[PDB]
Amino acid sequence: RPTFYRQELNKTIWEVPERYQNLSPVGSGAYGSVCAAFDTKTGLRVAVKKLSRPFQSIIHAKRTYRELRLLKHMKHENVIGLLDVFTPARSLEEFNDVYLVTHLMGADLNNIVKCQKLTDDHVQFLIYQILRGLKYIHSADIIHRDLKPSNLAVNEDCELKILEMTGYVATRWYRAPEIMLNWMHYNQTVDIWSVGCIMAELLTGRTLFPGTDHIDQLKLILRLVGTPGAELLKKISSESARNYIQSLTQMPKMNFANVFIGANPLAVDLLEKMLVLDSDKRITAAQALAHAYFAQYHDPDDEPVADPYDQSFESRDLLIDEWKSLTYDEVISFVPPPL
Numbered sequence: 001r002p003t004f005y006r007q008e009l010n011k012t013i014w015e016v017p018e019r020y021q022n023l024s025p026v027g028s029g030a031y032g033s034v035c036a037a038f039d040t041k042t043g044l045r046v047a048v049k050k051l052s053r054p055f056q057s058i059i060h061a062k063r064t065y066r067e068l069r070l071l072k073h074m075k076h077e078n079v080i081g082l083l084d085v086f087t088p089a090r091s092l093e094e095f096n097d098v099y100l101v102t103h104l105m106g107a108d109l110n111n112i113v114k115c116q117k118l119t120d121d122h123v124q125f126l127i128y129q130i131l132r133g134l135k136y137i138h139s140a141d142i143i144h145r146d147l148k149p150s151n152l153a154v155n156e157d158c159e160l161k162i163l164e165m166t167g168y169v170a171t172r173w174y175r176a177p178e179i180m181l182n183w184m185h186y187n188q189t190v191d192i193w194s195v196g197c198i199m200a201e202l203l204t205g206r207t208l209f210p211g212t213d214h215i216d217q218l219k220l221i222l223r224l225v226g227t228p229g230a231e232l233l234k235k236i237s238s239e240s241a242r243n244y245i246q247s248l249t250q251m252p253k254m255n256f257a258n259v260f261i262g263a264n265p266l267a268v269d270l271l272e273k274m275l276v277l278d279s280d281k282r283i284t285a286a287q288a289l290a291h292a293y294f295a296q297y298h299d300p301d302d303e304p305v306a307d308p309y310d311q312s313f314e315s316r317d318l319l320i321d322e323w324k325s326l327t328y329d330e331v332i333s334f335v336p337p338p339l
Protein backbone atom coordinates (compact mmCIF):
# COMPACT_ATOMS: atom_id res chain seq x y z
CA ARG A 1 0.00 0.00 0.00
CA PRO A 2 1.30 3.45 -0.95
CA THR A 3 1.36 6.56 1.24
CA PHE A 4 -1.53 9.02 0.96
CA TYR A 5 -1.44 12.78 1.53
CA ARG A 6 -4.45 15.02 2.08
CA GLN A 7 -5.38 18.48 0.78
CA GLU A 8 -8.50 20.56 0.05
CA LEU A 9 -9.04 21.82 -3.54
CA ASN A 10 -12.16 23.95 -4.28
CA LYS A 11 -14.56 22.64 -1.58
CA THR A 12 -13.60 18.95 -2.01
CA ILE A 13 -10.95 17.03 -0.02
CA TRP A 14 -8.49 14.82 -1.95
CA GLU A 15 -6.60 11.84 -0.49
CA VAL A 16 -4.32 10.50 -3.23
CA PRO A 17 -1.03 8.56 -3.14
CA GLU A 18 2.28 10.39 -3.06
CA ARG A 19 3.09 9.48 -6.68
CA TYR A 20 0.54 12.05 -7.93
CA GLN A 21 1.81 15.59 -7.32
CA ASN A 22 0.78 19.13 -8.27
CA LEU A 23 -2.99 18.48 -8.25
CA SER A 24 -4.80 21.26 -10.19
CA PRO A 25 -8.61 21.45 -10.67
CA VAL A 26 -9.43 21.09 -14.34
CA GLY A 27 -13.18 20.41 -14.30
CA SER A 28 -16.19 19.37 -12.26
CA GLY A 29 -19.79 18.29 -12.68
CA ALA A 30 -22.38 15.70 -11.65
CA TYR A 31 -20.06 12.72 -12.38
CA GLY A 32 -17.38 14.12 -10.08
CA SER A 33 -14.35 16.40 -9.85
CA VAL A 34 -11.30 15.99 -12.09
CA CYS A 35 -7.81 17.22 -11.22
CA ALA A 36 -4.73 17.39 -13.40
CA ALA A 37 -1.67 15.88 -11.73
CA PHE A 38 1.88 14.73 -12.40
CA ASP A 39 2.56 11.01 -11.96
CA THR A 40 6.12 10.70 -10.64
CA LYS A 41 6.32 6.95 -11.30
CA THR A 42 5.76 7.23 -15.07
CA GLY A 43 6.49 10.92 -15.69
CA LEU A 44 3.08 11.32 -17.33
CA ARG A 45 0.51 14.06 -16.87
CA VAL A 46 -2.64 12.32 -15.65
CA ALA A 47 -6.24 13.20 -14.81
CA VAL A 48 -7.58 12.13 -11.41
CA LYS A 49 -11.37 11.95 -11.07
CA LYS A 50 -12.90 11.74 -7.59
CA LEU A 51 -16.38 10.24 -7.80
CA SER A 52 -19.04 12.26 -5.97
CA ARG A 53 -21.30 10.38 -3.54
CA PRO A 54 -20.41 7.02 -5.15
CA PHE A 55 -22.73 5.05 -2.82
CA GLN A 56 -25.45 7.59 -1.82
CA SER A 57 -28.15 5.53 -3.63
CA ILE A 58 -28.62 2.24 -5.48
CA ILE A 59 -28.43 4.28 -8.70
CA HIS A 60 -25.13 5.80 -7.55
CA ALA A 61 -23.67 2.51 -6.30
CA LYS A 62 -24.54 0.57 -9.46
CA ARG A 63 -23.32 3.42 -11.67
CA THR A 64 -20.04 3.50 -9.73
CA TYR A 65 -19.63 -0.23 -10.35
CA ARG A 66 -20.61 0.12 -14.01
CA GLU A 67 -18.10 2.91 -14.72
CA LEU A 68 -15.27 0.99 -13.05
CA ARG A 69 -16.14 -2.22 -14.92
CA LEU A 70 -16.31 -0.32 -18.22
CA LEU A 71 -13.06 1.61 -17.76
CA LYS A 72 -11.19 -1.54 -16.70
CA HIS A 73 -12.30 -3.26 -19.92
CA MET A 74 -11.58 -0.54 -22.50
CA LYS A 75 -8.06 -0.99 -23.93
CA HIS A 76 -8.09 1.05 -27.14
CA GLU A 77 -6.21 4.11 -28.37
CA ASN A 78 -9.43 6.04 -29.10
CA VAL A 79 -11.25 5.14 -25.85
CA ILE A 80 -10.43 6.39 -22.36
CA GLY A 81 -8.72 3.71 -20.29
CA LEU A 82 -7.67 3.20 -16.69
CA LEU A 83 -4.10 3.90 -15.64
CA ASP A 84 -4.94 3.44 -11.95
CA VAL A 85 -7.84 3.22 -9.50
CA PHE A 86 -7.45 3.66 -5.76
CA THR A 87 -9.18 4.48 -2.48
CA PRO A 88 -7.67 5.84 0.76
CA ALA A 89 -9.70 3.31 2.77
CA ARG A 90 -7.86 0.34 4.27
CA SER A 91 -10.83 -2.07 4.40
CA LEU A 92 -14.32 -2.70 3.07
CA GLU A 93 -15.77 -1.15 6.24
CA GLU A 94 -14.21 2.27 5.56
CA PHE A 95 -14.63 2.14 1.75
CA ASN A 96 -16.19 5.52 0.95
CA ASP A 97 -14.39 7.22 -1.95
CA VAL A 98 -13.26 6.09 -5.41
CA TYR A 99 -10.56 7.76 -7.51
CA LEU A 100 -9.91 7.04 -11.19
CA VAL A 101 -6.73 7.95 -13.12
CA THR A 102 -6.20 8.21 -16.91
CA HIS A 103 -3.95 10.06 -19.36
CA LEU A 104 -4.53 13.84 -19.12
CA MET A 105 -6.46 15.12 -22.14
CA GLY A 106 -6.18 18.88 -22.49
CA ALA A 107 -9.44 19.76 -24.24
CA ASP A 108 -12.60 18.43 -25.89
CA LEU A 109 -14.10 18.77 -29.35
CA ASN A 110 -16.16 21.79 -28.24
CA ASN A 111 -13.03 23.78 -27.34
CA ILE A 112 -11.84 23.12 -30.92
CA VAL A 113 -14.99 23.63 -33.01
CA LYS A 114 -15.62 27.03 -31.42
CA CYS A 115 -12.02 28.29 -31.46
CA GLN A 116 -11.44 27.49 -35.14
CA LYS A 117 -13.13 26.37 -38.36
CA LEU A 118 -11.81 22.88 -39.03
CA THR A 119 -10.43 22.04 -42.45
CA ASP A 120 -11.65 18.92 -44.25
CA ASP A 121 -8.43 17.04 -43.47
CA HIS A 122 -8.90 17.63 -39.74
CA VAL A 123 -12.52 16.46 -39.94
CA GLN A 124 -11.43 13.21 -41.61
CA PHE A 125 -8.90 12.41 -38.89
CA LEU A 126 -11.20 13.32 -36.00
CA ILE A 127 -14.26 11.47 -37.31
CA TYR A 128 -12.10 8.46 -38.23
CA GLN A 129 -10.85 8.23 -34.64
CA ILE A 130 -14.41 8.42 -33.30
CA LEU A 131 -15.56 5.62 -35.61
CA ARG A 132 -12.46 3.54 -34.84
CA GLY A 133 -13.29 3.77 -31.14
CA LEU A 134 -16.98 3.19 -31.81
CA LYS A 135 -16.25 -0.03 -33.70
CA TYR A 136 -14.28 -1.23 -30.66
CA ILE A 137 -17.01 -0.21 -28.21
CA HIS A 138 -19.78 -1.67 -30.36
CA SER A 139 -17.90 -4.95 -30.84
CA ALA A 140 -18.23 -5.53 -27.08
CA ASP A 141 -22.04 -5.10 -27.35
CA ILE A 142 -21.76 -1.69 -25.67
CA ILE A 143 -23.76 1.37 -26.74
CA HIS A 144 -22.43 4.79 -25.73
CA ARG A 145 -25.91 6.44 -25.88
CA ASP A 146 -24.55 9.95 -25.12
CA LEU A 147 -22.02 10.80 -27.83
CA LYS A 148 -21.50 14.57 -27.96
CA PRO A 149 -18.56 16.97 -28.45
CA SER A 150 -17.99 17.43 -24.70
CA ASN A 151 -17.58 13.63 -24.37
CA LEU A 152 -14.74 13.52 -26.95
CA ALA A 153 -11.34 14.37 -25.46
CA VAL A 154 -8.63 15.76 -27.75
CA ASN A 155 -5.01 16.79 -27.12
CA GLU A 156 -2.64 19.03 -29.06
CA ASP A 157 -1.67 16.08 -31.28
CA CYS A 158 -5.30 15.98 -32.42
CA GLU A 159 -5.44 12.55 -30.83
CA LEU A 160 -9.03 11.72 -29.85
CA LYS A 161 -10.51 9.52 -27.14
CA ILE A 162 -14.15 8.76 -26.33
CA LEU A 163 -15.20 9.36 -22.72
CA GLU A 164 -32.86 11.16 -10.68
CA MET A 165 -32.55 14.83 -11.61
CA THR A 166 -28.83 15.44 -11.02
CA GLY A 167 -27.08 16.20 -14.31
CA TYR A 168 -30.27 16.90 -16.25
CA VAL A 169 -29.81 18.12 -19.85
CA ALA A 170 -33.05 19.64 -21.29
CA THR A 171 -32.42 18.96 -25.02
CA ARG A 172 -29.77 16.74 -26.65
CA TRP A 173 -28.93 18.07 -30.12
CA TYR A 174 -27.00 14.85 -30.85
CA ARG A 175 -29.58 12.26 -29.76
CA ALA A 176 -31.00 9.84 -32.30
CA PRO A 177 -34.69 10.46 -33.11
CA GLU A 178 -35.70 6.94 -32.08
CA ILE A 179 -34.65 7.78 -28.52
CA MET A 180 -36.55 11.08 -28.74
CA LEU A 181 -39.57 8.93 -29.62
CA ASN A 182 -38.79 6.79 -26.53
CA TRP A 183 -38.31 3.61 -28.54
CA MET A 184 -37.06 0.89 -26.17
CA HIS A 185 -35.46 -1.34 -28.87
CA TYR A 186 -32.90 1.22 -30.20
CA ASN A 187 -29.64 -0.41 -31.43
CA GLN A 188 -25.94 0.55 -31.60
CA THR A 189 -26.56 2.84 -34.59
CA VAL A 190 -27.95 5.49 -32.24
CA ASP A 191 -24.27 6.37 -31.79
CA ILE A 192 -23.81 6.66 -35.56
CA TRP A 193 -26.55 9.30 -35.64
CA SER A 194 -24.64 11.31 -33.03
CA VAL A 195 -21.45 11.03 -35.09
CA GLY A 196 -23.33 12.42 -38.08
CA CYS A 197 -24.50 15.40 -36.04
CA ILE A 198 -20.95 15.92 -34.75
CA MET A 199 -19.41 15.58 -38.22
CA ALA A 200 -21.94 18.06 -39.62
CA GLU A 201 -21.05 20.53 -36.86
CA LEU A 202 -17.35 20.25 -37.70
CA LEU A 203 -18.03 20.84 -41.40
CA THR A 204 -20.35 23.85 -41.04
CA GLY A 205 -19.45 25.32 -37.64
CA ARG A 206 -23.13 25.30 -36.61
CA THR A 207 -25.19 22.91 -34.52
CA LEU A 208 -27.15 20.79 -36.98
CA PHE A 209 -30.30 20.30 -34.85
CA PRO A 210 -30.29 22.96 -32.09
CA GLY A 211 -33.78 22.14 -30.85
CA THR A 212 -35.33 23.82 -27.83
CA ASP A 213 -37.14 20.73 -26.50
CA HIS A 214 -37.91 17.14 -27.48
CA ILE A 215 -40.79 18.22 -29.75
CA ASP A 216 -38.76 20.99 -31.39
CA GLN A 217 -35.84 18.58 -31.77
CA LEU A 218 -37.96 16.14 -33.78
CA LYS A 219 -39.32 18.94 -35.98
CA LEU A 220 -35.79 20.12 -36.81
CA ILE A 221 -34.67 16.57 -37.64
CA LEU A 222 -37.69 15.85 -39.84
CA ARG A 223 -37.12 19.06 -41.81
CA LEU A 224 -33.76 17.73 -43.04
CA VAL A 225 -34.28 13.96 -43.37
CA GLY A 226 -38.00 14.10 -44.20
CA THR A 227 -40.99 12.51 -42.55
CA PRO A 228 -40.86 8.71 -42.15
CA GLY A 229 -41.73 6.71 -45.25
CA ALA A 230 -44.07 3.71 -45.36
CA GLU A 231 -41.42 1.08 -44.47
CA LEU A 232 -40.38 3.04 -41.36
CA LEU A 233 -43.99 3.74 -40.49
CA LYS A 234 -44.73 0.01 -40.37
CA LYS A 235 -42.18 -0.36 -37.54
CA ILE A 236 -43.74 2.22 -35.15
CA SER A 237 -45.70 0.36 -32.38
CA SER A 238 -46.76 3.28 -30.11
CA GLU A 239 -49.98 4.61 -31.73
CA SER A 240 -49.27 7.90 -29.95
CA ALA A 241 -46.09 8.31 -32.00
CA ARG A 242 -47.47 6.80 -35.22
CA ASN A 243 -50.52 9.08 -35.21
CA TYR A 244 -48.34 12.06 -34.24
CA ILE A 245 -45.90 11.53 -37.10
CA GLN A 246 -48.80 11.09 -39.54
CA SER A 247 -50.69 14.12 -38.16
CA LEU A 248 -47.63 16.31 -38.64
CA THR A 249 -46.90 18.24 -41.82
CA GLN A 250 -45.34 15.92 -44.39
CA MET A 251 -41.77 17.11 -44.97
CA PRO A 252 -39.69 15.81 -47.88
CA LYS A 253 -36.11 14.64 -47.55
CA MET A 254 -33.84 17.56 -48.39
CA ASN A 255 -30.88 17.39 -50.77
CA PHE A 256 -27.80 17.12 -48.56
CA ALA A 257 -25.62 18.50 -51.37
CA ASN A 258 -27.72 21.68 -51.08
CA VAL A 259 -27.60 21.79 -47.27
CA PHE A 260 -23.84 21.22 -46.93
CA ILE A 261 -22.73 23.40 -49.82
CA GLY A 262 -19.03 23.56 -50.67
CA ALA A 263 -18.33 20.53 -48.47
CA ASN A 264 -16.41 17.50 -49.70
CA PRO A 265 -18.87 15.39 -51.74
CA LEU A 266 -17.36 12.35 -50.03
CA ALA A 267 -18.27 13.89 -46.67
CA VAL A 268 -21.80 14.68 -47.85
CA ASP A 269 -22.26 11.09 -49.06
CA LEU A 270 -21.20 9.80 -45.63
CA LEU A 271 -23.56 12.19 -43.83
CA GLU A 272 -26.43 10.88 -45.96
CA LYS A 273 -25.65 7.34 -44.77
CA MET A 274 -25.33 8.36 -41.10
CA LEU A 275 -28.35 10.67 -40.79
CA VAL A 276 -30.94 8.11 -41.87
CA LEU A 277 -34.23 8.02 -39.96
CA ASP A 278 -34.57 4.23 -40.12
CA SER A 279 -31.95 2.78 -37.77
CA ASP A 280 -32.07 -0.50 -39.72
CA LYS A 281 -30.60 1.33 -42.73
CA ARG A 282 -28.06 3.46 -40.84
CA ILE A 283 -24.42 2.78 -41.68
CA THR A 284 -22.48 0.96 -38.98
CA ALA A 285 -19.16 2.05 -37.51
CA ALA A 286 -17.25 -0.74 -39.25
CA GLN A 287 -18.91 0.07 -42.59
CA ALA A 288 -18.24 3.79 -42.11
CA LEU A 289 -14.51 3.18 -41.61
CA ALA A 290 -14.31 1.65 -45.10
CA HIS A 291 -16.03 4.67 -46.69
CA ALA A 292 -13.91 6.44 -49.30
CA TYR A 293 -13.95 9.57 -47.11
CA PHE A 294 -11.31 7.94 -44.86
CA ALA A 295 -9.19 6.51 -47.69
CA GLN A 296 -5.97 8.01 -46.30
CA TYR A 297 -6.50 6.67 -42.75
CA HIS A 298 -8.40 3.39 -43.16
CA ASP A 299 -6.41 0.28 -42.22
CA PRO A 300 -8.46 -2.92 -41.85
CA ASP A 301 -5.58 -4.58 -39.97
CA ASP A 302 -5.40 -1.68 -37.46
CA GLU A 303 -9.05 -1.29 -36.40
CA PRO A 304 -9.37 -3.92 -33.67
CA VAL A 305 -12.39 -5.25 -31.83
CA ALA A 306 -12.88 -5.73 -28.10
CA ASP A 307 -12.71 -8.78 -25.89
CA PRO A 308 -16.12 -10.07 -24.73
CA TYR A 309 -17.64 -7.86 -22.03
CA ASP A 310 -19.86 -9.43 -19.36
CA GLN A 311 -22.89 -7.16 -18.91
CA SER A 312 -24.90 -9.65 -16.82
CA PHE A 313 -24.68 -7.33 -13.79
CA GLU A 314 -26.90 -4.75 -15.51
CA SER A 315 -30.06 -6.79 -14.85
CA ARG A 316 -29.22 -7.45 -11.19
CA ASP A 317 -31.20 -6.05 -8.24
CA LEU A 318 -28.62 -5.97 -5.44
CA LEU A 319 -28.34 -3.93 -2.26
CA ILE A 320 -26.14 -0.87 -1.79
CA ASP A 321 -23.72 -2.88 0.36
CA GLU A 322 -23.47 -5.50 -2.41
CA TRP A 323 -22.71 -3.01 -5.19
CA LYS A 324 -20.23 -1.39 -2.80
CA SER A 325 -18.49 -4.69 -2.06
CA LEU A 326 -18.44 -5.58 -5.77
CA THR A 327 -16.80 -2.22 -6.52
CA TYR A 328 -14.20 -2.76 -3.79
CA ASP A 329 -13.33 -6.14 -5.30
CA GLU A 330 -12.73 -4.49 -8.68
CA VAL A 331 -10.50 -1.84 -7.08
CA ILE A 332 -8.18 -4.34 -5.41
CA SER A 333 -8.08 -6.78 -8.35
CA PHE A 334 -7.05 -3.99 -10.75
CA VAL A 335 -3.71 -4.53 -12.50
CA PRO A 336 -2.15 -1.56 -14.34
CA PRO A 337 -1.20 -1.80 -18.02
CA PRO A 338 2.49 -2.06 -18.93
CA LEU A 339 4.37 1.24 -19.14
Ligand SMILES: CN(C)c1cc(-c2ccncc2)c(-c2ccccc2)nn1
Pocket residue numbers: 027029031034047048049080100101102103104105106150151153163
Ligand atom coordinates in the same frame (compact mmCIF):
# COMPACT_ATOMS: atom_id res chain seq x y z
C1 LIG B 1 -17.08 14.57 -18.18
N1 LIG B 1 -15.69 14.83 -18.52
C2 LIG B 1 -15.39 15.98 -19.36
C3 LIG B 1 -14.70 14.02 -18.06
C4 LIG B 1 -13.37 14.26 -18.41
C5 LIG B 1 -12.40 13.40 -17.89
C6 LIG B 1 -10.98 13.62 -18.29
C7 LIG B 1 -10.22 12.61 -18.88
C8 LIG B 1 -8.93 12.88 -19.29
N2 LIG B 1 -8.35 14.08 -19.16
C9 LIG B 1 -9.08 15.05 -18.60
C10 LIG B 1 -10.38 14.87 -18.16
C11 LIG B 1 -12.84 12.37 -17.04
C12 LIG B 1 -11.95 11.38 -16.38
C13 LIG B 1 -12.24 10.02 -16.42
C14 LIG B 1 -11.44 9.10 -15.77
C15 LIG B 1 -10.34 9.53 -15.06
C16 LIG B 1 -10.03 10.87 -15.00
C17 LIG B 1 -10.83 11.79 -15.66
N3 LIG B 1 -14.14 12.20 -16.76
N4 LIG B 1 -15.07 13.03 -17.26
Ligand SMILES: Fc1ccc(-c2n[nH]cc2-c2ccncc2)cc1
Pocket residue numbers: 177178181182183228232235236237238241245277278279280
Ligand atom coordinates in the same frame (compact mmCIF):
# COMPACT_ATOMS: atom_id res chain seq x y z
F1 LIG C 1 -39.83 10.11 -36.55
C1 LIG C 1 -39.18 8.93 -36.39
C2 LIG C 1 -37.89 8.96 -35.92
C3 LIG C 1 -37.23 7.76 -35.75
C4 LIG C 1 -37.85 6.55 -36.04
C5 LIG C 1 -37.14 5.27 -35.87
N1 LIG C 1 -36.00 5.04 -36.53
N2 LIG C 1 -35.61 3.79 -36.17
C6 LIG C 1 -36.48 3.24 -35.32
C7 LIG C 1 -37.48 4.15 -35.10
C8 LIG C 1 -38.62 3.91 -34.20
C9 LIG C 1 -39.15 4.92 -33.40
C10 LIG C 1 -40.22 4.64 -32.57
N3 LIG C 1 -40.79 3.44 -32.48
C11 LIG C 1 -40.28 2.47 -33.24
C12 LIG C 1 -39.21 2.65 -34.10
C13 LIG C 1 -39.16 6.57 -36.53
C14 LIG C 1 -39.83 7.77 -36.70
Ligand SMILES: [Zn+2]
Pocket residue numbers: 060164165166
Ligand atom coordinates in the same frame (compact mmCIF):
# COMPACT_ATOMS: atom_id res chain seq x y z
ZN1 LIG D 1 -27.80 11.21 -8.10
